[PDB]
Structure formats: structure tokens, C-alpha cells
């Protein structure tokens, strides 16, 4: 535009207002812009107010030099050497001098950043108070901003303000400024080239961190900015809803509409966030700051999660989800940050416990059918389901904030917003809408699906929205569309979790039927004994012989229930395989993790037996009476599995010992070695003990627990047997021999032998070879451990096993 | 110690007692103007108890000073607050608090 | 050059060593991305073998000795030899970055000299090479993560505040933050104790409601006056606290960019806006609020009327509440151009214009806008200079502008 003129532009979206383009244009082959999209296009018009920009090499000719007292020269060998302002970079807090030298008309002051005057003169502030009339009321303000005029001039530090001039003192010093910030500011009317030189320390004391600060220095961060006229700036996308009158003039706006901003603090100025799409250095840097914030609260630092909730303040993230113009890097960053604060702890806990399947035998866990004549999201599953608890990050209190769990968020509101996001995105990004939310379809889709996946894991979305999203994707569409690579690499985990929930439903149903069937056949055992040589051989022979001479008892009721289960074993199973083959037949694949996940899902479709093969020897049933200790031990064991991957680890061992002592004191650990052996928790504790060695009190605390685990059942002792060679090569000095003597790795190895004759016969010769290699003493003391282990290796039963 | 402007008066006389539920909305930014906490913003009306010694001393004495429905600027001394040691991560060492607190209900 | 300068100087290769040095940088170049997978593995296996040939000869220690004995000057000899100095340093640290990036064994061999490199980190000339060497070491050695302690990290936090703002520093700090598989939690406690709390070293986000600023369409240069009234406030449309502002300005100065001017746009923020309205009824000036009280102590609530006057022959502004003194505000301020009331807010708030319809008029000043309707307009109201205008067909646009009571007769 020029002086007082009007623009009228059409960037697509305006087929109803094409004045001449259906006439000529579209017929010849041209196009509008935004035919597909719903968005507008923002415009970066020119501003008016000057903001002091950096100094490029591409000036006309004005060139500063970086010279170490710490001087910055000039040169302007041109024609136009008149109007060039020069504000400097970094401010003063509210003692140290700062001298300016001129080689041959020159203003010197201390400018606060609220200053944009583009005028060549001395131009431009006395607020009043009251004691209901005043009487002092006036010592307030003059700054708007600050002007003085080979000379050497110093605005020294502290607080007050100082005006000196070549040793002499010019008058009218403005020594009153309580809480502002100032810049060393020198303008220019360059009468000649070689016009300035700049600088018992200096401003390096004031600005930077250290303040002994006796040697002064210009750092690299010190720029020498030039107040250029304008930059392109954004367009204030939605502004006005004025309702008013003209007799009464009821001028009224009722707008919930917020900005989204930041300010670079070192050159203080507020800037809105979503303008930054072209400020690529600041883009990359604030992206990396979000990535660091995601890195910091990774896997358990919940105290620091409270800290980041103080910083970034979760409803700000909620507004950051909705913004349909924020760039994709900020989009991925904030989508990661909401996860890595509020979700990933309970998420990774359930990801660890997704292979345990244990379920009590109560009344709710009993009325479950098989699939009748696609809905895995049913009402079921009190199968021990480690519950979720949260915190409330206030910043006034104590007790304790370091074990407190995780910060909160608007749960159902969040899931409704994600449902809205998914539906509206699927409706938009289908026809090649040439403007996605973040620029491409990857930043559009990928972290949305990541958030939806991690939210789907967390046991939210009661069954209505499950039906909604399923036959949104199913209809029986989402997956049927054309998609890029990491999008479906994300979606494969959705399909994983769907099939896994199907497996959970399947196993809970088979446990219910097993309860009914065992009740019936237990009564049949009662009557078959009460009718009268096949006595119990430890009750495994009884069930094995029941299924063995019943490999087709042998009542027809038994055969009917057998046929009932073998028709329980018999429409997603179609479409998953169909679409995996469909993807792989067309779209020659990179990122081999995608190939991995695809074909793992494909084999897992065709081996529905095999999941039930490798799932059932890790499930277990509880009576229903002692469930509270089971919840407590599952919570303790989940947080000790999370403690496995700290890794180092020097002061969380207090939490480790507290957890292990509770696992000791839990009642279920006494009577249920099936459950403890089923959790794999001995191997967990053992690998923790591996990680501790290649010497604190942690080792003996582990070895005590292994030894107490070796003394509850024989099959437990078989389980703790086979670690002998590694446990032996650990056991050289590892514990017990200042005077500790309670447990040690060698004490664990001896703890797995003492009862059973069978394990005494099972062990072999190179182990004892390594033991007598370790018997290479010269004095001493710790050979008593080797001899003690051999004593437990030779005799064991009242007579020595002679081999 | 601490000097607190009543921004807006509440009912003036209803100052609480130890054993009465201190249902509050509050927020607060630092001396520089940067925010650090906002119980307004997560839409949780905060509760505590004076005498049960739940909050910092400046916020406790300011809640003791105010009345029902009294929005007030509770600028507090840093050494009454965390102050020198600071809240390690949230509040820097030796920073003065500036509040915006209004009492809601009493039980 | 420890003691003497003659000949000058000595058999002392410059271009020979630098040529051989660029050759050796090109020697250990990583295998490319657009190479076939088996050829990639061939080049990669031979590259790791060529590194393991150098580790078991201690050549890196020889490089460290050359680092020891080169870091002397600040830019000597026959001073073409001192002119290649930046290139020799840059190439040596690039070569040091080359010899570690693959093997876990070599960055395990760098258990020793890491703290000395953090000491050399403050040369403040060549942060790039030392930083990249340190990053590639910290990635692949979980040994050296057990080494590094508080003073190192405090120096690295200070390193950005020396050298401005580098994302590569944040890549380094993220690498310190998380191992190959695990973390180290006390290290992260140290990070968030020593970097965040104070919010100055890096950025900080915040959002606020869009601020609406309006004006009654009439430039006004004669003791001026106006009257408005608050009708409904409800100050918590969102959890952000809202605001009401009443004051004077001109467009000659303070280009009114809403949000994009001073902080949040707003009012009382520039060298023309002189705002009013609080509870504890003080003002803003340059987006700074100092703390005038008055014996009313009331907000701008739903039934409030504000006396609003501008002063002739003294550039002075003083406002009142229902005529009652609010300890009068402004005296002896700046003068240019034609002024107007710039009464502003950002909320769900309705107000009125009492400019003809009146309630209130005291004789501290008298020139209302209803008594200056004369020049061109009638009583109309606009939206503060409006570089936009919004529709649903086409947001049209506007050119910039072409913008007293002592007239000019012909001087005869």
C-alpha cells in the first residue's frame, strides 16, 4: 500500500467471490490457493516501531570491530552518515565504570527498552502523589529517556545514576530509578568515519554471573545492535466482537481469547509464540529447551515434575494443544512434555505389568462369556490392575514432594479434547489438504496418535468413547487411509494393545470357567473316593492323570465341558492381516523397526494359540481375602522394577531397602512361591545385584533376600540353583568378610543346596574346580567361606553323597 | 515483618480461627513479575488450616489478617518465606513474593 | 619458541602439518547415508578397525600434548605461522572429534583428561571443537557419566552465559541428563537446582487475554473533559485476571499494535498513554504501576463512574471517582498532536459513553467531546488506528495515515 489506500486480496477459499477467474483462469488451468484447507493464511505486514536488531556483515558500510580496554570501533566511509541509532544488548539490574571515546553532536544516555523514537533532535514526565493533597508526593519520574551530549563519559553503577564527563561533572544527574533496566546508549550523527570507541572492572561485573569480577572483558554474547526501522510481523488472527449502541452506547466485548507469548530476557521484549515460525534460530533453540525439559523428568523424578509444573503450567499446555497454527516442532515438544510430566510413570508401570494376568476368584470375575454369535472394551478385569494416584502441585507446603506421585490435569476434559482432535483431523487430512497444522502430515498425525496411545493405556475412556473410536476406525475409516511411515509405525502399537486387551479378556474368561469346572470335578473326586490305589503323588499326578486317562473319570459332563472349551478356542483378525499384507505389497519399506512391528503383529495374528501358550504359565489366582497385600506388593514390585532402570543410583538404595523389607514383611510372600516365582522377581533382584557389582551395604541386603527366598519351597530352590557359575565368579570377596557374615553371594550359592539330595546330585565338577582355584590362600580368613560351601556341597543328608 | 494491602475488601471482620477450613483461591508472581504458581489456573480451590501449620508463615499470617471474600496483595518478606535456601527449583534464593489471594469459605 | 625467536625461526612446518591434518580429517570420515548397506558396514568396520589401531598406540595422547603446547597465544613467530593458528586449532579439535565417535573403548579411554578439557572450555575462542568432542564422548561412554560432578556442570551452565545461546550446549546437557538406557537422578536434581531457578538464562512462556483498545473517533487538541461508566465486570472469564484502563494519548507516537507494541499492548505503556484504574486506585505509566492510594478503595466494579478531565495551560491529568479526589495524578507532561480518550480493557465487560445522555460534570475543566462535535464528525467511536479490518469475505486493508486552537491569519 501507499498513503491512504485499500487492499482486497483472495488467497483461495473464495470461489464464491471470483469476479473474473471462472471467466479466464480455471478454464486455462490456473488455481486459487486454499481450495482444500480450512485455515486462513497469516500475513506478515510491516510495522512502524523500530526495534534494535543485530549487526550483519551485509551492511551498506557500517562495521564494528571486536577488540580487547575492550574497545569497539566503527567506520562509515559512505555518503549518508546522518541518522543511525545504536542501542546496546544487555541490561542493568536495579561501582563499575563505562567510558566512551569519540575521535573528532553525539548523544549519550541510558535507554530503557520502551523506546522507539525515530527523530533527530532532543525530544521526549512528573507524576504526582497525595497525602490527600500531596506535600511531598513528587519524587517519581522523569524517564521516558536519558540524554547527555576526546571526551570520556561514564554512567557508573549504583542504587542511583551517575553523570561524569572527562573528570568533570556535568549537571542534572537523574539519580532515581528503583526497579528498571538500562542500556548503554549512544546515537550517531557521523560527521566522519572512525566515529566511536567503546568499552576497576567494567559492565562484565554487572551483567554476568560472577561478582569478584576484577578483570573485565567483553564476552562474545555482547552485541552492538543497530536500531533498524522495521521487521515483518504477524496479523492478530481473531480480534473483535464489539456489540454497542448509539443512544446509550452499550459498547461490549465478551471474548475468551488469549495470546501465547514469551520474552527473551537478556534483551527484554515480549514476543508472541506463534510468530516465531520464521525466527529459525530462536525456533531451534526453544525446541531444544522443550526437548531438554522432556529429558529432565524422564522416568521418575516427580519432584522435578512439580518444578516443571511451576514453570510451564499445564493449562498453558492445554492451550498449546488446540492452536491450529503453532509450528510442528513446538507441537511435538509440548505433546512430549504433557506425556513426560503427567502420564509416563503410570504408563510405563502398566507397560511393565502387561504380562502378569493374575486375577482373584470373586463374584465379578465370574460372569464372563466367550465371544458370542468387534468390542474388546468391555466391563471386566479387576485383575490386580495397579491403581493410579496423583499429587496437587501447590507451592506453599511441605511433606514431602519427593515421593509424591505425579501432578494432575483435567482428565476427562483432556480425553474429550483428544477425541475432538482425532475426529476433526481425520475429516480434514483426507483430500490432501495442502496446509496441515504443523506443515506436514507427520507433525499433524504422529504425536496425536502417541498421546492417544499413551492415554489408551492408562485405563480411561469408559466404553462409550471406546465404541465411538473403534467403529470410527473399524467401521464394521482411519486405518484404511493412505499414511506415511512413522504414522503407521505409531499405529502398530495401537493394534498391539487391542490384541493384548483381547488376550486379557480371553484369559479372564478361561479362569472363570476353570473355577466352575474345578468345583464340579472336586466334588467328583469326593464321590469317587467315597465310593471306595491311585493315591495322591503330590496332587500333580492327580490332575495329570485326570487329563491323561481323560485325554479324549471320563464322564460325559467332563466331555461336554472339554468340548465347550475347545469351541471357546474357535472380526479384527481378518483386517489386521489383510492391511499388513496390503501395506507391504505397495510401499517398499524403510525404517526397519516398522518391518519388525508389522510382522510381529502378523505372526501374532496367526498364532493366537501361541499367545495363550506363553501367557498362561504366568497367571495365578488369589482367594479374594488377602488382596490388599497383593496390591501393596505389586505396587512395591513395580516401583522396584522402576528402580532397576535408574540405574546409578547411590541414594535411592534407601528406597530399595525399604521396598525389600516390606517384601519380606508381606504375608503373601510366605505362602505363595508360585506367585513369586511367577513374577520373575528373583531374577529382577538378582540382576539388580549384578548391576551393583562389576561396594555398599546394598549387596548384602540383596543376598539376604535371595537366601530367605531359597528357604520356602523345593521348586524355589531349583529356581535359585542354576545361577551357580555366575554367582560363583561374583563370589570372590563380595561380602561377609570384615565380619559381616549374614549373607554374601557365596552364601546365596550355599543357600540353594542344603536341603535337596537331587540338587546335590545335580551340581557338577568345574564349579568345584573354580572353588579350589579360589582356594589359593597365603595366610587367610575368608577361606572359611570356601570350606563351608564345600561342607554344604558334600554331605547334606546324614551321609555324604559320595560322588 | 509483613505488610499487606487489602486490594478489595471482603466483609472486613470475619477473620478466621484455628479449626476453620481455609478455602482459598490464590496465585502469585515473583518480585520481577514472573509467575511461579497459580492455584487459579488449575481450577483447584485450595484448602489448608492455620494452626495445623500447613503453609509458609507469610501466607499463614496473611490469611490470618484478611476476611471473607477479601482479594488482597500479600507481599511477604523473603526471610519469612523460603528465602535464603529457597525452594530448590521453583523459588530462587532471596526472592520476595507478591500474591493475589481471596478467601472463599470457612468451616 | 619457549625462549628465542631466531632464525626466524626453526624447522617448523605449517602448511605441511595443516595439509596432513586436513588429510587425516578426511581419512576418518564417516560412511555416508546414500551408500548401500553392505558397503556401509564395510566402511564402518574398517573405520572402527582403523580407530582401534590408533588407540593402542596412544596417538590421542600425542594430540593432547600438541594441544598442551599450542594453547599459548591469543593472536609469536614469523607471523604467517601465527596466522594459520585458528585453522590449526579448529582442525585439531575436529580431528579429536573424529577419533572417538564410534568406539565405546576410546571414550572409555577418555576417563582421564575430561576435567582438563572442561578447564580449557573457557578459552572463549574455540568452544565448537571442545564442545563437540565433549558431546561425542558423553554419548558413548557410560563410564564418564559416573565421573562428572558439580563444578563441571556449573561451568557448563555458565558457558551459555558466556557464549550467548547455543542449542549444541543443550544437546550436551541432554546427553548428561540421560544415559544410553537409564538416567542419573542426582545429576538432574543438580540441573534443575542450578539452571532454571531465576528464569534468566533461557526463555519463558506466558499467555494473556487479547487486549481491546478503543477511542471516540475524534482527535482533540480548551480544558478538556469526558465521562464514562462501568456496567458489568465479572473479572474471571478465564483464570487470568482482567483489567480496565482509562486514559489519554495520541497516535503521533505509540503506534498501537495490540500485543505487538509494548507488553500485551495494554495502556499506560508508552510515551503517549497515561492510564487510570486500579483498586487501591493508582495508575500505569510506561507499563510501570506506582502506588497512589485514595480514600475510596474500590475496584472499577459494576456501578462506578469516573471523573475524567484534561488540563489546559498545564500539561496535567487528574481523574476522580464520583467527583471525589483520587490524589491527582499527572502534572507537566509531554505535548504533541491531538489527543483522545483511549479507554481500554480485556474482558467480558460492557461500558457506556456519556457524551450526549449525561450524568456528571464538575468545573475542574470543561470541554467535553460533546462540546467539540463541530469539525467533521458526529458522535462516533472507533477501534484505535485499525491496521486490520476483519470480514468473512476479505479482510481489507488501510494505508498508514496523513496525520491546535491558535489559528493562522495571513501575516501582513
PDB file of N, CA and C in Angstrom, chain A residues 221-284:
ATOM      1  N   UNK A 221      28.828 -12.810  23.788  1.00  0.00           N
ATOM      2  CA  UNK A 221      27.396 -12.533  23.825  1.00  0.00           C
ATOM      3  C   UNK A 221      27.082 -11.047  23.681  1.00  0.00           C
ATOM      4  N   UNK A 222      28.036 -10.178  23.990  1.00  0.00           N
ATOM      5  CA  UNK A 222      27.853  -8.742  23.840  1.00  0.00           C
ATOM      6  C   UNK A 222      27.765  -8.369  22.371  1.00  0.00           C
ATOM      7  N   UNK A 223      26.574  -7.985  21.943  1.00  0.00           N
ATOM      8  CA  UNK A 223      26.363  -7.426  20.625  1.00  0.00           C
ATOM      9  C   UNK A 223      26.319  -5.906  20.720  1.00  0.00           C
ATOM     10  N   UNK A 224      26.249  -5.266  19.562  1.00  0.00           N
ATOM     11  CA  UNK A 224      26.367  -3.820  19.441  1.00  0.00           C
ATOM     12  C   UNK A 224      25.277  -3.301  18.513  1.00  0.00           C
ATOM     13  N   UNK A 225      24.031  -3.657  18.846  1.00  0.00           N
ATOM     14  CA  UNK A 225      22.867  -3.598  17.964  1.00  0.00           C
ATOM     15  C   UNK A 225      22.634  -2.226  17.344  1.00  0.00           C
ATOM     16  N   UNK A 226      22.000  -2.234  16.177  1.00  0.00           N
ATOM     17  CA  UNK A 226      21.668  -1.023  15.447  1.00  0.00           C
ATOM     18  C   UNK A 226      20.158  -0.965  15.321  1.00  0.00           C
ATOM     19  N   UNK A 227      19.574   0.138  15.769  1.00  0.00           N
ATOM     20  CA  UNK A 227      18.124   0.290  15.832  1.00  0.00           C
ATOM     21  C   UNK A 227      17.567   0.511  14.426  1.00  0.00           C
ATOM     22  N   UNK A 228      17.362  -0.595  13.711  1.00  0.00           N
ATOM     23  CA  UNK A 228      16.815  -0.503  12.366  1.00  0.00           C
ATOM     24  C   UNK A 228      15.308  -0.281  12.415  1.00  0.00           C
ATOM     25  N   UNK A 229      14.739   0.006  11.243  1.00  0.00           N
ATOM     26  CA  UNK A 229      13.404   0.586  11.197  1.00  0.00           C
ATOM     27  C   UNK A 229      12.322  -0.453  11.444  1.00  0.00           C
ATOM     28  N   UNK A 230      12.320  -1.549  10.689  1.00  0.00           N
ATOM     29  CA  UNK A 230      11.189  -2.456  10.818  1.00  0.00           C
ATOM     30  C   UNK A 230      11.553  -3.869  10.387  1.00  0.00           C
ATOM     31  N   UNK A 231      10.719  -4.801  10.838  1.00  0.00           N
ATOM     32  CA  UNK A 231      10.696  -6.222  10.552  1.00  0.00           C
ATOM     33  C   UNK A 231       9.266  -6.626  10.229  1.00  0.00           C
ATOM     34  N   UNK A 232       9.069  -7.701   9.474  1.00  0.00           N
ATOM     35  CA  UNK A 232       7.706  -8.177   9.234  1.00  0.00           C
ATOM     36  C   UNK A 232       7.131  -8.857  10.465  1.00  0.00           C
ATOM     37  N   UNK A 233       5.839  -8.626  10.696  1.00  0.00           N
ATOM     38  CA  UNK A 233       5.197  -9.030  11.942  1.00  0.00           C
ATOM     39  C   UNK A 233       3.751  -9.419  11.695  1.00  0.00           C
ATOM     40  N   UNK A 234       3.221 -10.258  12.585  1.00  0.00           N
ATOM     41  CA  UNK A 234       2.044 -11.058  12.271  1.00  0.00           C
ATOM     42  C   UNK A 234       0.780 -10.208  12.441  1.00  0.00           C
ATOM     43  N   UNK A 235      -0.386 -10.845  12.382  1.00  0.00           N
ATOM     44  CA  UNK A 235      -1.569 -10.205  11.842  1.00  0.00           C
ATOM     45  C   UNK A 235      -2.771 -10.262  12.780  1.00  0.00           C
ATOM     46  N   UNK A 236      -2.611 -10.802  13.997  1.00  0.00           N
ATOM     47  CA  UNK A 236      -3.613 -10.741  15.074  1.00  0.00           C
ATOM     48  C   UNK A 236      -4.921 -11.426  14.658  1.00  0.00           C
ATOM     49  N   UNK A 237      -4.844 -12.763  14.627  1.00  0.00           N
ATOM     50  CA  UNK A 237      -5.668 -13.588  13.744  1.00  0.00           C
ATOM     51  C   UNK A 237      -7.171 -13.478  14.024  1.00  0.00           C
ATOM     52  N   UNK A 238      -7.586 -13.356  15.286  1.00  0.00           N
ATOM     53  CA  UNK A 238      -9.005 -13.170  15.617  1.00  0.00           C
ATOM     54  C   UNK A 238      -9.114 -12.083  16.680  1.00  0.00           C
ATOM     55  N   UNK A 239      -9.835 -10.996  16.378  1.00  0.00           N
ATOM     56  CA  UNK A 239      -9.768  -9.820  17.240  1.00  0.00           C
ATOM     57  C   UNK A 239     -11.080  -9.417  17.904  1.00  0.00           C
ATOM     58  N   UNK A 240     -12.122  -9.067  17.147  1.00  0.00           N
ATOM     59  CA  UNK A 240     -13.148  -8.131  17.616  1.00  0.00           C
ATOM     60  C   UNK A 240     -14.525  -8.788  17.595  1.00  0.00           C
ATOM     61  N   UNK A 241     -15.270  -8.631  18.690  1.00  0.00           N
ATOM     62  CA  UNK A 241     -16.697  -8.930  18.717  1.00  0.00           C
ATOM     63  C   UNK A 241     -17.454  -7.824  19.452  1.00  0.00           C
ATOM     64  N   UNK A 242     -17.231  -6.566  19.056  1.00  0.00           N
ATOM     65  CA  UNK A 242     -17.930  -5.442  19.684  1.00  0.00           C
ATOM     66  C   UNK A 242     -19.433  -5.477  19.429  1.00  0.00           C
ATOM     67  N   UNK A 243     -20.199  -5.432  20.513  1.00  0.00           N
ATOM     68  CA  UNK A 243     -21.600  -5.046  20.491  1.00  0.00           C
ATOM     69  C   UNK A 243     -21.689  -3.680  21.158  1.00  0.00           C
ATOM     70  N   UNK A 244     -22.405  -2.743  20.530  1.00  0.00           N
ATOM     71  CA  UNK A 244     -22.544  -1.395  21.072  1.00  0.00           C
ATOM     72  C   UNK A 244     -23.881  -0.806  20.645  1.00  0.00           C
ATOM     73  N   UNK A 245     -24.175   0.382  21.170  1.00  0.00           N
ATOM     74  CA  UNK A 245     -25.330   1.183  20.775  1.00  0.00           C
ATOM     75  C   UNK A 245     -24.883   2.569  20.325  1.00  0.00           C
ATOM     76  N   UNK A 246     -25.878   3.398  19.991  1.00  0.00           N
ATOM     77  CA  UNK A 246     -25.674   4.800  19.666  1.00  0.00           C
ATOM     78  C   UNK A 246     -26.619   5.736  20.408  1.00  0.00           C
ATOM     79  N   UNK A 247     -27.464   5.218  21.302  1.00  0.00           N
ATOM     80  CA  UNK A 247     -28.194   6.018  22.293  1.00  0.00           C
ATOM     81  C   UNK A 247     -28.101   5.216  23.587  1.00  0.00           C
ATOM     82  N   UNK A 248     -27.053   5.478  24.355  1.00  0.00           N
ATOM     83  CA  UNK A 248     -26.696   4.644  25.482  1.00  0.00           C
ATOM     84  C   UNK A 248     -25.290   4.112  25.311  1.00  0.00           C
ATOM     85  N   UNK A 249     -24.956   3.729  24.072  1.00  0.00           N
ATOM     86  CA  UNK A 249     -23.625   3.277  23.643  1.00  0.00           C
ATOM     87  C   UNK A 249     -23.112   2.116  24.496  1.00  0.00           C
ATOM     88  N   UNK A 250     -23.835   1.000  24.436  1.00  0.00           N
ATOM     89  CA  UNK A 250     -23.523  -0.165  25.263  1.00  0.00           C
ATOM     90  C   UNK A 250     -22.375  -0.976  24.661  1.00  0.00           C
ATOM     91  N   UNK A 251     -21.200  -0.347  24.622  1.00  0.00           N
ATOM     92  CA  UNK A 251     -20.026  -0.934  23.985  1.00  0.00           C
ATOM     93  C   UNK A 251     -19.525  -2.121  24.802  1.00  0.00           C
ATOM     94  N   UNK A 252     -19.444  -3.280  24.154  1.00  0.00           N
ATOM     95  CA  UNK A 252     -19.334  -4.539  24.868  1.00  0.00           C
ATOM     96  C   UNK A 252     -18.605  -5.566  24.019  1.00  0.00           C
ATOM     97  N   UNK A 253     -17.608  -6.209  24.617  1.00  0.00           N
ATOM     98  CA  UNK A 253     -16.947  -7.373  24.050  1.00  0.00           C
ATOM     99  C   UNK A 253     -16.941  -8.455  25.115  1.00  0.00           C
ATOM    100  N   UNK A 254     -17.148  -9.699  24.700  1.00  0.00           N
ATOM    101  CA  UNK A 254     -17.347 -10.825  25.609  1.00  0.00           C
ATOM    102  C   UNK A 254     -16.459 -11.995  25.208  1.00  0.00           C
ATOM    103  N   UNK A 255     -15.165 -11.723  25.027  1.00  0.00           N
ATOM    104  CA  UNK A 255     -14.264 -12.613  24.308  1.00  0.00           C
ATOM    105  C   UNK A 255     -13.374 -13.406  25.250  1.00  0.00           C
ATOM    106  N   UNK A 256     -13.509 -14.720  25.335  1.00  0.00           N
ATOM    107  CA  UNK A 256     -12.366 -15.521  25.782  1.00  0.00           C
ATOM    108  C   UNK A 256     -11.396 -15.777  24.635  1.00  0.00           C
ATOM    109  N   UNK A 257     -10.288 -15.043  24.591  1.00  0.00           N
ATOM    110  CA  UNK A 257      -9.286 -15.209  23.539  1.00  0.00           C
ATOM    111  C   UNK A 257      -7.940 -14.781  24.087  1.00  0.00           C
ATOM    112  N   UNK A 258      -7.003 -15.705  24.187  1.00  0.00           N
ATOM    113  CA  UNK A 258      -5.735 -15.381  24.809  1.00  0.00           C
ATOM    114  C   UNK A 258      -4.597 -15.416  23.800  1.00  0.00           C
ATOM    115  N   UNK A 259      -3.521 -14.719  24.147  1.00  0.00           N
ATOM    116  CA  UNK A 259      -2.289 -14.759  23.376  1.00  0.00           C
ATOM    117  C   UNK A 259      -1.536 -16.047  23.666  1.00  0.00           C
ATOM    118  N   UNK A 260      -0.276 -16.063  23.251  1.00  0.00           N
ATOM    119  CA  UNK A 260       0.671 -17.113  23.603  1.00  0.00           C
ATOM    120  C   UNK A 260       2.032 -16.476  23.378  1.00  0.00           C
ATOM    121  N   UNK A 261       2.786 -16.212  24.442  1.00  0.00           N
ATOM    122  CA  UNK A 261       3.925 -15.317  24.306  1.00  0.00           C
ATOM    123  C   UNK A 261       5.164 -15.868  24.985  1.00  0.00           C
ATOM    124  N   UNK A 262       6.260 -15.136  24.787  1.00  0.00           N
ATOM    125  CA  UNK A 262       7.480 -15.286  25.564  1.00  0.00           C
ATOM    126  C   UNK A 262       8.211 -13.950  25.556  1.00  0.00           C
ATOM    127  N   UNK A 263       9.322 -13.883  26.287  1.00  0.00           N
ATOM    128  CA  UNK A 263      10.243 -12.770  26.122  1.00  0.00           C
ATOM    129  C   UNK A 263      11.670 -13.265  26.284  1.00  0.00           C
ATOM    130  N   UNK A 264      12.528 -12.903  25.337  1.00  0.00           N
ATOM    131  CA  UNK A 264      13.959 -13.129  25.504  1.00  0.00           C
ATOM    132  C   UNK A 264      14.380 -12.211  26.643  1.00  0.00           C
ATOM    133  N   UNK A 265      14.914 -12.743  27.719  1.00  0.00           N
ATOM    134  CA  UNK A 265      15.066 -11.936  28.932  1.00  0.00           C
ATOM    135  C   UNK A 265      16.310 -11.071  28.904  1.00  0.00           C
ATOM    136  N   UNK A 266      17.312 -11.484  28.135  1.00  0.00           N
ATOM    137  CA  UNK A 266      18.569 -10.755  28.105  1.00  0.00           C
ATOM    138  C   UNK A 266      18.486  -9.462  27.305  1.00  0.00           C
ATOM    139  N   UNK A 267      17.469  -9.299  26.471  1.00  0.00           N
ATOM    140  CA  UNK A 267      17.257  -8.067  25.725  1.00  0.00           C
ATOM    141  C   UNK A 267      15.778  -7.717  25.767  1.00  0.00           C
ATOM    142  N   UNK A 268      15.245  -7.659  26.993  1.00  0.00           N
ATOM    143  CA  UNK A 268      13.851  -7.824  27.410  1.00  0.00           C
ATOM    144  C   UNK A 268      12.832  -7.163  26.493  1.00  0.00           C
ATOM    145  N   UNK A 269      11.978  -7.996  25.895  1.00  0.00           N
ATOM    146  CA  UNK A 269      10.914  -7.591  24.985  1.00  0.00           C
ATOM    147  C   UNK A 269       9.941  -8.745  24.772  1.00  0.00           C
ATOM    148  N   UNK A 270       8.654  -8.499  24.986  1.00  0.00           N
ATOM    149  CA  UNK A 270       7.657  -9.555  24.876  1.00  0.00           C
ATOM    150  C   UNK A 270       7.366  -9.864  23.412  1.00  0.00           C
ATOM    151  N   UNK A 271       7.367 -11.150  23.064  1.00  0.00           N
ATOM    152  CA  UNK A 271       7.106 -11.618  21.706  1.00  0.00           C
ATOM    153  C   UNK A 271       6.108 -12.765  21.790  1.00  0.00           C
ATOM    154  N   UNK A 272       5.059 -12.709  20.976  1.00  0.00           N
ATOM    155  CA  UNK A 272       4.110 -13.809  20.910  1.00  0.00           C
ATOM    156  C   UNK A 272       4.754 -15.064  20.323  1.00  0.00           C
ATOM    157  N   UNK A 273       4.255 -16.231  20.752  1.00  0.00           N
ATOM    158  CA  UNK A 273       4.893 -17.502  20.401  1.00  0.00           C
ATOM    159  C   UNK A 273       4.743 -17.794  18.920  1.00  0.00           C
ATOM    160  N   UNK A 274       3.523 -17.783  18.412  1.00  0.00           N
ATOM    161  CA  UNK A 274       3.319 -18.338  17.084  1.00  0.00           C
ATOM    162  C   UNK A 274       3.735 -17.397  15.957  1.00  0.00           C
ATOM    163  N   UNK A 275       4.407 -16.287  16.260  1.00  0.00           N
ATOM    164  CA  UNK A 275       5.054 -15.507  15.214  1.00  0.00           C
ATOM    165  C   UNK A 275       6.368 -16.141  14.801  1.00  0.00           C
ATOM    166  N   UNK A 276       7.004 -16.855  15.720  1.00  0.00           N
ATOM    167  CA  UNK A 276       8.389 -17.312  15.663  1.00  0.00           C
ATOM    168  C   UNK A 276       8.705 -18.305  14.542  1.00  0.00           C
ATOM    169  N   UNK A 277       7.710 -18.607  13.703  1.00  0.00           N
ATOM    170  CA  UNK A 277       7.802 -19.581  12.624  1.00  0.00           C
ATOM    171  C   UNK A 277       8.887 -19.267  11.605  1.00  0.00           C
ATOM    172  N   UNK A 278       9.332 -18.020  11.518  1.00  0.00           N
ATOM    173  CA  UNK A 278      10.444 -17.658  10.660  1.00  0.00           C
ATOM    174  C   UNK A 278      11.718 -17.345  11.430  1.00  0.00           C
ATOM    175  N   UNK A 279      11.630 -17.091  12.735  1.00  0.00           N
ATOM    176  CA  UNK A 279      12.816 -16.833  13.545  1.00  0.00           C
ATOM    177  C   UNK A 279      13.450 -18.176  13.873  1.00  0.00           C
ATOM    178  N   UNK A 280      14.249 -18.664  12.924  1.00  0.00           N
ATOM    179  CA  UNK A 280      14.616 -20.072  12.913  1.00  0.00           C
ATOM    180  C   UNK A 280      15.646 -20.414  13.976  1.00  0.00           C
ATOM    181  N   UNK A 281      16.543 -19.483  14.297  1.00  0.00           N
ATOM    182  CA  UNK A 281      17.486 -19.722  15.384  1.00  0.00           C
ATOM    183  C   UNK A 281      16.764 -19.824  16.718  1.00  0.00           C
ATOM    184  N   UNK A 282      15.848 -18.895  16.974  1.00  0.00           N
ATOM    185  CA  UNK A 282      15.067 -18.936  18.199  1.00  0.00           C
ATOM    186  C   UNK A 282      14.128 -20.134  18.212  1.00  0.00           C
ATOM    187  N   UNK A 283      13.651 -20.537  17.032  1.00  0.00           N
ATOM    188  CA  UNK A 283      12.849 -21.748  16.878  1.00  0.00           C
ATOM    189  C   UNK A 283      13.601 -22.980  17.338  1.00  0.00           C
ATOM    190  N   UNK A 284      14.782 -23.186  16.759  1.00  0.00           N
ATOM    191  CA  UNK A 284      15.603 -24.339  17.082  1.00  0.00           C
ATOM    192  C   UNK A 284      15.987 -24.340  18.547  1.00  0.00           C
TER     193      UNK A 284
END
